[PDB]
Amino acid sequence: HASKDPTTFPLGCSPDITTPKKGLSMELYSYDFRKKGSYPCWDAAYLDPNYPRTGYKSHRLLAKVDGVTGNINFYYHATKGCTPQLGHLPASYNYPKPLTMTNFTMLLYGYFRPKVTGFHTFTISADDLLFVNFGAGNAFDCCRRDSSADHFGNYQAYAIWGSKTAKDELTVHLDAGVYYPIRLFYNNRDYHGALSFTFKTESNENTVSDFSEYFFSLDDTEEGCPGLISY
Template identity: 30%
Template sequence: MRYDLYLCILVVQFFFQVIHAQSGDSSNNGAIHESSGCAFTSSATGNGFLARFYNYTLGAAYSKTYLESGYATYGKSLGSVSGVTSVNFQYSGLTNGPLTRTIYGKSITVTNFTLMLTGYFYASESGYYKFSLTNSDDAALFYAASASAFDCCGSTSLSSSANLDDVSIYTYYTGPNGYRQIYLEKGYFYPVRLAYLNMQGNLNLNFGVTYPSGAYVNSFSGIVYQFDTSSTVLTHQHQLL
């Protein structure tokens, strides 16, 4: 990368970080008392997340809109991997040039890519679940238990009703760690979507969930599932007043 272009990118990054620090980020605190879940009448078709990969559009790292849907509009699909139960990864000591590594068993140019993870999170307890994203490098965005993750009880493709105001967590490199407590009811499956990107160099994704009982998990076998979109479902809405 040319030095002048690299310097320009650093300036843009700094600008977004200053704005973020001054305005705060309401998506990284508080609790969500309303949730939308599903009760399926058929068995799950898969265990774990579905991971979709896209190339990265230079300069979009700190745009919520890009992470919400822009990567699918402007980025080229690089394929997918099913059955992802261990979602976290880290590579350090990387240069800013194109470098290839393995993510979920798939060879990817890790120095510039976008990732979307989708699935249904099973609530085995009733209460507030604390979803967390820490040390994201470069940026990550998380939706849960709403139509903005994807259309509830339907396809895990992008939701037609996605709303940036529904973002549960948004975090980025050098920014604050993000968390959100969401009330989920035992026995239901809740749509979740995690979007991540790396724009250059090192990368890190660290996602986990603390259960109402206090147990912490960052591996999702037997917790996140896939379902046939033609399954008969009952939509469950829950709200604490």
């Protein structure tokens, strides 16, 4: 160089006849540096309170893909600060092309399906930013993302590199086989990048990092697909 509030007992969704499709949807957007000579060289727009809501959409759209699943963690090691440098996302992201891994924004959305009924703790870390919404309402409404995408509530967990919250966790009680809306919003402002998203349950001692049997996409429907299990 559902209510929008985060909760420990989130609401979930009950899909009907159509088989859920594997994986999350992802959108990729540009995130330019500031003009040469600026101090610092990186743009602080990523921290504007509405950047994850409306601001990101004013940047150049790079891609929109389906079927993102597996292990979505990555570490991108840059060689120079203040410089756009190319790299590739892991194959799990279904995006073959190079992108500026030093400086970009990424949105992932869809549903998390548990295998365990009970408490789950999701652990996150990021360079630079990962904001997580989770649950109907807090993320978006069941099979009604089209009317609720931009209306997510306060984050269930968030991580900001360099901050007092560089890693974070969310503990929620979930029901096996129910589909929970999830939104992951990521940014790299400069230099190295990293995303880590894993979970554990009170059940066993394994950390889950491969979401192949956990992330799904559901079609929106006129009436929605609110969870039919809770009572």
